[PDB]
Structures are given as C-alpha cells and as structure tokens.
C-alpha cells in the first residue's frame, strides 16, 4: 500500500483537494488508501470513493469507445490495412480499464460490502459492484462474458431487493440504482422492455412520494427523476 504511511484523515482531506483540482486519478488513489485502513466509510466518504473512480473509469470508457469505433472502421470492406496498431492501442486502454474495475471490485470485496449492514451503505456498495461489472461487460468478448453480465445482474438485483424493502421510493440511492439497472437492461442484457418498465415504475412511484419531502430532499429526488425521464424519452 503506497498510502500505508499516510493518516486516514489526511487521505480524506487530500481526496477532497484532488476533487477541487480535478485530479481524479490522485483522488482515487487517496480513497483507495483510505478504504485500506480497514474502517467503514461514512456517507460523505463513500461518495468521494465513487466520484473518484467514476471519473477515472468514465474517461477510460470514452477513450475505449473512440478507439473501438476507429478499429471497427478499419475492419470494413475497402479499408486500407494499417497494421496491428489500432487493435494494440485499444487493447492497452481496455486492459487499463479492466484493471481499474478489478481494483474497485476488490475494495468492495475486501471488505466494504461484508461490513455494510445499514441499507444506505449496503445498497450503495452493491450498486457500485453492479456498475463496475457492467463496465467490464461493455468490453467483454470472450468465454466469460455471460458470467460477467450475470455478476452485474446479481449485484444490482440484491441492491434492488434491499432498496425496495428498506428505503422510500424517493431515496436518491434507490433512484440512482434503478436508473443504472435500467441502463444495464437496455444496453447490456438486450432487454429494452425491462429497461423501460423499470424506469417508468421507478419514476411513477417516486412521483407519488414527493409530497412527504422537504424542499431540499425534493430537489435531490426530482433531479434523478428527470434522468429517468430523459432515458425514457431516448428509448420511446
């Protein structure tokens, strides 16, 4: 552990500075160090962890998509042979992306999920597990693709089951989980009808619970509800 000699509180402080400086690789390294201290994470600290890795992997995914498109065009009829370089570089980026996903999944497995007993923490981590398996699935083409997809599905499903039992329909973690599981259905599992049904049912059940909320909670929940609506508009 490169961060083994730094205090937990200093790692957290520096993660916050790295976020302000848009240094997301540093932010992720600091938060990995904080997790490896072995203590549970607070709400704020869980969000630092997720933001850091979301931004790192988000950049890798965007780059992978650019390179994959170039590679696809190189393999069309009439395209002039340019050698192994496009495939090699796409593979380089892909391997880096898989490494980041494996790092996150490793933190969740050792030992964030097993120590998370409150619904808010457990659902948060299980959503992350689904998300990072989904990112692995986006680039998977081999013998294990089905198993990767099923790992994502299983994590999301456990998170959904807990969220429906333990959280109100407007809870932002519940809403974001459903948003992302809906995308999993549409983009990964070839299940657009399931995707649409989940987004609709989630939106409508949240709408019906908004009356219970403060102004500030209302703002939070309605922001995520609009993302559900945006996806529904894209898909219908």
């Amino acid at each position: 552990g490169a961060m083994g000699s730094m205090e937990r509180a200093s790692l957290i402080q520096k993660a916050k500075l790295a976020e302000q400086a848009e240094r997301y690789e540093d932010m992720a390294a600091f938060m990995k160090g904080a997790v490896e201290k072995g203590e549970e994470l607070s709400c704020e600290e869980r969000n630092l962890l997720s933001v850091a890795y979301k931004n790192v992997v988000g950049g890798q995914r965007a780059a992978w998509r650019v390179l994959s498109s170039i590679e696809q065009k190189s393999n069309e009829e009439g395209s002039e042979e340019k050698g192994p370089e496009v495939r090699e570089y796409r593979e380089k980026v892909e391997t880096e992306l898989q490494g980041v996903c494996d790092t996150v999944l490793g933190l969740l497995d050792s030992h964030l999920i097993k120590e998370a007993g409150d619904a808010e923490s457990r659902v948060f981590y299980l959503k992350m597990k689904g998300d990072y398996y989904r990112y692995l699935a986006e680039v998977a083409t081999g013998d294990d693709k089905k198993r990767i997809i099923d790992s994502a599905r299983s994590a999301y499903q456990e998170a959904m089951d807990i969220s429906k039992k333990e959280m109100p329909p407007t809870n932002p973690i519940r809403l974001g989980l459903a948003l992302n599981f809906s995308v999993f259905h549409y983009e990964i599992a070839n299940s657009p009808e399931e995707a649409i049904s989940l987004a609709k049912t989630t939106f409508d059940e949240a709408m019906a619970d908004l009356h219970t909320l403060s102004e500030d909670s209302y703002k939070d929940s309605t922001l995520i509800m609009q993302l559900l609506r945006d996806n529904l508009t894209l898909w219908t």
Binding site: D131, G176, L179, N180, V183, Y186, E187, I224, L227, D230, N231, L234, W235
Partner: peptide, 5 residues
C-alpha cells in the same frame, strides 16, 4: 449514451 449516476 443514456444517463447513469
């Protein structure tokens, strides 16, 4: 691409 959080 669709929205995720």
């Amino acid at each position: 691409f669709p929205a995720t959080v």
